[PDB]
Amino acid sequence: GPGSDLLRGDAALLDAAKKGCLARVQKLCTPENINCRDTQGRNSTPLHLAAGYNNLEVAEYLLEHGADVNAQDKGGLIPLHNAASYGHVDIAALLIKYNTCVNATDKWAFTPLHEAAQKGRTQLCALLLAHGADPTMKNQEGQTPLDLATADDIRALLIDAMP
């Protein structure tokens, strides 16, 4: 019935966005499911998955068809957090071009710069800083991105950017 049809379609769109299969994304996307959610996992949208799994053209396709650049998963992450976590520079630059909030905060008040700093993503850190990421922001535990950084190159980068 229409209900199970919608369920099958949502799941197939999320899978296609994770795998980067643009032909399936084009076929299955609708204005009603563009921001559908992986309810069995992190409640990610197709754009979260395209960002996290480094599928740039699927990501821009989703953005060009109304994907919410500031949609939050169950932890408060927006897709820029996923790109920051895994170091996907071109994805992050695209999300910034589509007016994402560079200093967005998740449920623990981590910003994308906290995420890139903790995960060792040096060029992503530099990109975020060049677009106004604030290295003085503390998460809920009181930690700046520098406090989370363990790599020499990222620590040097953040120390330079901080007052």
Partner: peptide, 10 residues
């Protein structure tokens, strides 16, 4: 914090 789990991606 401790409950924080990884973002979707690779």
């Amino acid at each position: 914090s401790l409950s924080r789990t990884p973002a979707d991606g690779r």
